[PDB]
């Protein structure tokens, strides 16, 4: 295939929407509704230069909407759970437990300190902490203070963390006494009743910046709540026990943490920065873990080498890379009560954009389908002309809806070339994210992952 946002004969144009977002657009393709040409027919480099110069702030800033922003923020939903059951266990780490009330208390004490240091909506904070209670207190406090957090995974080299922190422009860093001195030049604080804060944060405000050159996907509260609330791909509730084992700086993190905290569920934190298969098996048995979210390779290893990591587990969801159907089939045979799901999506569209609930018929095949979009999200299979691919035909996958990031912090050109105008959307200007993935939509509407656009 040959993408029109990378190579187009007719030239390029720069589009703008009511919220001042910029989009690169091929000159010969009709301007979508809610979008207007800001920079005339020019070279792709010339268009990208204009965006790099004019688009200084990625956060949406335009006229006020009729309908006031729907929904509560991440921390507000957490606060209602702390109020409802303060004595209920929120976090488990090694032999220690942290209730909902104690977690909320600790996070409020730190949030008040953050406010005193200049944290407010529109401010980002770096969190350079190992996996444990402090990591949660830190990010919850950042959210409570109206700011957005960025997880700085301590397994990574200092240079990579320093670059990521530099890119966010965060004027504050939350770290620990052992990690002290690794990251320099940014004002640093440590983690040491108070009461909940009322800061004026709203769902469109930045909640996080995710880093996998560094690429910081910055996402509002609604991208997180839109992924965890009003969804049925896994069981959510206070009787659930999630395992936070996935890397902290990427998008699978939120499901394990927020999917539990917004519902009053227990969250087991794994020691170590990377998913540890042997530790996972032990943690499932110790705490009665009800849901596992695993990369395809982790899932395959556990299925074969640590099958008891699935004992008592209600849902197992495969992510990232294409699934191994023989391993999915093996899990079904060994664990008959286990519900299996295959999740798909880039971090730019938050956690899963699409999900497929595994059925008996899928096991006879060679690949697992990526499924159907989550409620409030959408997925298109388009050709080089941004036209829907013929049913069954190959095309590039574009994702849209509630999970969309504002963009790549400090990289408006890279943003404008990936978070493009949506040509299917109503009078209001919407965006779609080009995934770089090739897919096909089968007769029943189920998506199938093919490969990379290379």
Q: Terminal CA-to-CA distance of the chain, rounded, Å?
A: 8
Instruction: Determine the Cα–Cα distance for residues 306 and 281; give it in Å rounded to an integer.
Output: 6
Helical residues (DSSP H) of 262-405, grouped into ranges: 277-287, 296-305, 325-334
> Of 10, 30, 65, which closes a domain?
65
The total of structural domains in the chain comes to 2
Q: Do 35 and 22 form a contact (C-beta atoms < 8 A)?
A: no
Q: Are residues 224 and 298 in the same domain?
A: yes
The helix (H) or strand (E) run that includes residue 55 is none
CA pseudo-torsion sign 169, 174, 177, 179 = negative
Alpha-carbon span 77 to 425, nearest angstrom: 30
How far apart are the C-alpha atoms of 215 and 10, rounded to whole Å?
29
Q: Write down the H helix ranges in 55-157.
A: 74-84, 100-116, 133-144
Is residue 165 within 8 A of residue 186, CB to CB? The reply is: yes
Question: How many Cβ atoms sit within 10 Å of the Cβ of residue 221?
Answer: 25
Q: Are 273 and 130 in contact (CB under 8 A)?
A: yes
220, 19 Cβ separation under 8 angstroms: no
Return the bridge partners of 318, or none: 294, 342
Find the helix packing angle between 74-84 and 221-228, rounded to 10°: 50
Query: How are beta strands 148-151 and 206-210 bridged, if at all?
Result: parallel
- Please spell the DSSP secondary structure of 146-186, one letter per residue: T-EEEE--TTS-HHHHHHHHHHHT-SEEEE-TTTTTSS-SS
H-helix or E-strand spanning residue 401? strand 394-401
Count of C-beta atoms within a 10 Å radius of residue 368:
23
The enclosing domain of 18 has a CATH number of 3.90.820.10
Both 38 and 185 in a single domain?
Answer: no
Does residue 119 sit in the same domain as residue 230?
yes
Experimental method for this entry? X-ray
Sheet harboring 22-26: ordered strands across?
Answer: 22-26, 12-17, 35-42
Would you give the DSSP letter of residue 238? T
For strands 315-319 and 339-344, give the pairing: parallel
- State the DSSP H helix or E strand holding residue 39, giving kind and residue range, or none if neither: strand 35-42
**Do residues 69 and 203 make contact, with C-beta atoms less than 8 angstroms apart?**
yes
Q: Measuring CA to CA, how many Å separate 95 from each of 22, 105, 157, 270, 287?
A: 50, 21, 29, 11, 11
Do 213 and 272 reside in the same domain of the chain? yes
Task: Please check whether residue 264 is in contact with residue 237, taking contact to mean a CB–CB distance below 8 angstroms.
Answer: yes
Task: Give backbone dihedrals phi and psi of 283, rounded to 5 degrees, phi first.
Answer: -70, -35
The C-alpha atoms of residue 444 and residue 283 are separated, in whole angstroms, by 39
Residues 6+ apart with CB under 8 A from 423: 29, 30, 32, 386
User: Last residue of some domain: 65, 88, 115?
Assistant: 65
Radius of gyration of the chain (CA): 22
User: Resolution of the experimental model in angstroms, please?
Assistant: 2.4
Q: Are residues 246 and 309 in the same domain?
A: yes
Alpha carbon 367 to its chain's center: 25
Residues 140 and 49 in one domain: no
Q: What 3-state class would DSSP assign to 296?
A: helix
CA-to-CA dists, residue 274 to 56, 245, 279, 286, 290, angstroms: 35, 7, 11, 19, 20
**Residue closest to 173 by CA, chosen among 138, 197, 215:** 138
105: containing domain: 66-454
Chosen domain end from 26, 44, 65: 65
397 DSSP assignment:
E
């Amino acid at each position: 295939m040959s993408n029109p946002f990378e190579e187009y004969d007719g030239g390029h144009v720069v589009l703008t929407d009511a919220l001042g977002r910029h989009s690169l657009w091929p000159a010969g393709i009709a301007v979508p509704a809610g979008w207007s040409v800001r920079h005339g027919t020019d070279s792709r480099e010339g268009c990208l230069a204009h965006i790099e110069h004019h688009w200084t702030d990625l956060r949406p800033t335009g006229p006020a909407v009729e309908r006031a922003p729907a929904g509560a923020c991440v921390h507000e939903l957490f606060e209602a759970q702390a109020a409802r059951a303060p004595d209920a266990v929120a976090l488990l780490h090694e032999a220690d437990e942290l209730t909902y009330g104690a977690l909320n208390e600790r996070a409020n004490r730190l949030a008040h300190r953050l406010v005193g240091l200049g944290v407010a909506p529109g401010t980002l904070v770096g969190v350079h902490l190992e996996r444990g209670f402090d990591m949660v207190v830190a990010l919850l406090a950042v959210l409570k203070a109206g700011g957005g957090y960025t997880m700085l995974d301590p397994q990574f080299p200092v240079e990579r963390l320093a670059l990521s922190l530099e890119d966010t422009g965060a004027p504050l860093l939350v770290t620990s006494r052992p990690l002290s001195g690794r990251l320099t030049g940014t004002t640093t604080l440590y983690v040491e009743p108070a009461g909940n804060l009322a800061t004026g944060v709203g769902p469109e405000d930045v909640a996080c910046v995710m880093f996998t050159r560094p690429k910081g996907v910055m996402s509002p509260h609604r991208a997180l709540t839109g992924t965890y609330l009003g969804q049925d791909y896994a069981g959510f509730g206070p009787d659930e026990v999630f395992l936070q084992c996935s890397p902290v700086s990427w998008d699978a993190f939120g499901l394990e943490l927020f999917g539990a905290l917004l519902f009053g569920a227990r969250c087991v934190l794994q020691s170590g920065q990377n998913p540890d298969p042997l530790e996972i098996g032990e943690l499932v048995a110790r705490h009665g873990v009800t849901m596992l979210q695993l990369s395809a390779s982790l899932f395959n290893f556990l299925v074969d080498e640590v099958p008891e990591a699935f004992e008592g587990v209600r849902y197992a969801i495969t992510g990232g890379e294409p699934a191994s159907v023989p391993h999915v089939a093996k899990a079904r045979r060994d664990h008959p009560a286990l519900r299996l799901g295959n999740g798909y999506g880039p971090a730019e569209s938050m956690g899963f954009t699409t999900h497929h609930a595994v059925v008996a018929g899928d096991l006879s095949g060679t690949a697992l389908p990526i499924g159907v979009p989550l409620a409030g999200k959408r997925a298109y299979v388009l050709d080089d002309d941004l036209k829907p691919a013929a049913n069954g035909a190959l095309g590039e996958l574009y994702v849209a809806g509630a999970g969309l990031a504002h963009g790549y912090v400090s990289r408006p050109a890279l943003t404008a070339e990936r978070f493009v105008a949506d040509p299917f959307a109503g009078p209001g200007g919407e965006r779609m994210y080009r995934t770089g993935d090739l897919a096909r939509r089968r007769a029943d509407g189920v998506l199938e992952y093919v490969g990379r656009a290379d």
